[PDB]
Amino acid sequence: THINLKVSDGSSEIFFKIKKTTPLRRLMEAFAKRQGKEMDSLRFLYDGIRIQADQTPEDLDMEDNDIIEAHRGSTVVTTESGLKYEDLTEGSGAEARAGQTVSVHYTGWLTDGQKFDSSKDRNDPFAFVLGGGMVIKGWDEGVQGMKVGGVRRLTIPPQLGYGARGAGGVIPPNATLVFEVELLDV
Ligand SMILES: O=C(OCCOC(=O)[C@@H]1CCCCN1S(=O)(=O)Cc1ccccc1)c1cccnc1
Numbered sequence: 001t002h003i004n005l006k007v008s009d010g011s012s013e014i015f016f017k018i019k020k021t022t023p024l025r026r027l028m029e030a031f032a033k034r035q036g037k038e039m040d041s042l043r044f045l046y047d048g049i050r051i052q053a054d055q056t057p058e059d060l061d062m063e064d065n066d067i068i069e070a071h072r073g074s075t076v077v078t079t080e081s082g083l084k085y086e087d088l089t090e091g092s093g094a095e096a097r098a099g100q101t102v103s104v105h106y107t108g109w110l111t112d113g114q115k116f117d118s119s120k121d122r123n124d125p126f127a128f129v130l131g132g133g134m135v136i137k138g139w140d141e142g143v144q145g146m147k148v149g150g151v152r153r154l155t156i157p158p159q160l161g162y163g164a165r166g167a168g169g170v171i172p173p174n175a176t177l178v179f180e181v182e183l184l185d186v
């Protein structure tokens, strides 16, 4: 009667138990609500083809514990330091440049989807001197060339992050870090 289903974001994996007779829109909206994002902004796949919210698990021949991929073209850049970045939204305002004090909103996750900090929780934009060594090296390099309005996803290897020691209580040794950085002002 019921089925268990895993929805994967490439990092986080959330399990859902729904009735096979139900259309998957409630699963989609529920997975989208946790991310605090609208459902329109995410495309769900199952065995390749995109899921329309009108379809049901039975209508798609889903077995217990099958997986659904979740996604937002996409252009992931790898720089000479190992930094990876992807511009989710291209800004059209001014360009962030070393020496400026730039203001941002951000969320930071471990590569298992676990969120460890966010300026949005206190609804308090974060400012810093770009390239001045106030922040982990992955930010000083990753936020240069953003434009006001932009959302950039930074994937920071540990030596551009907190290294072999990590950060007390929260960030393990050798952790790769993922940040969505929104540039507010330069
Ligand atoms: O001075 C600050 O931050 C210090 C550097 O923080 C950093 O370099 C990076 C990059 C810039 C954004 C913040 N992070 S973080 O990973 O989330 C740091 C972090 C947070 C939670 C758990 C472990 C560690 C700061 C930030 C916010 C308010 N008042 C001061």
Ligand SMILES: [Mg+2]
Binding pocket: 124, 125, 126, 127
């Ligand atoms: Mg602030």
